[PDB]
Amino acid sequence: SLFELGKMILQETGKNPAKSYGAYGCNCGVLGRGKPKDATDRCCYVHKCCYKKLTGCNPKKDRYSYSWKDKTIVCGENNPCLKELCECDKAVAICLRENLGTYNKKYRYHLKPFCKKADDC
Amino acid sequence: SLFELGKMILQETGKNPAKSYGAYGCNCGVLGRGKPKDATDRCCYVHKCCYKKLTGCNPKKDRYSYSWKDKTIVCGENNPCLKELCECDKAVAICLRENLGTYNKKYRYHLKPFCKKADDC
User: Site Important residue of the cationic membrane-docking site (MDoS): which residues (chains A, B)?
Assistant: First the structure.
């Protein structure tokens, strides 16, 4: 769920998830997908795509377990869907952290900016 | 859409909507709901619950018509959902204005991962 995702993003990136990624580029945020603007945006693209293969569970609402031991996200067993959901979130948190170096505040927005259609999942 | 909502917030509160309410507390802006931190936050919680009742229109993208008449938000469309969305937005803008007395700038950019689970709507 959004709670685990936001926490993972904070844990990995150290950034306020909403502030830095709630409205960034064409894919980080709640306005679907689009042609990624940069590495960070591409992370959110993969993430959104990852959510699509999920079967039955609700990425936004379903809570799942994961440990942060040794400052590494380990998705707990949970169940197939929740596990996969967890990995989707873990992946995006790690990716965002990995791309902090090219994170560009210019891609933040309040209102959706110009996006081309994500080539799709 | 976020456009009308933001204009309403600016009209009612006189504050830049993104800055003051784009990521306020646990419910204003991204990452869904959480237990309201204060009255301003609760307005956003109510707002998100209001959105949950919309049938057939998209609060994020659907534009709608409203008028600001005598400094009063007046929703326009005959379209049932769009009218309801407009009313959801009007209500939050009004509510945010009403609670500007306790608006806590520290909650502006509140780290949403600190939020406690929200009761459902």
Answer: 105, 108
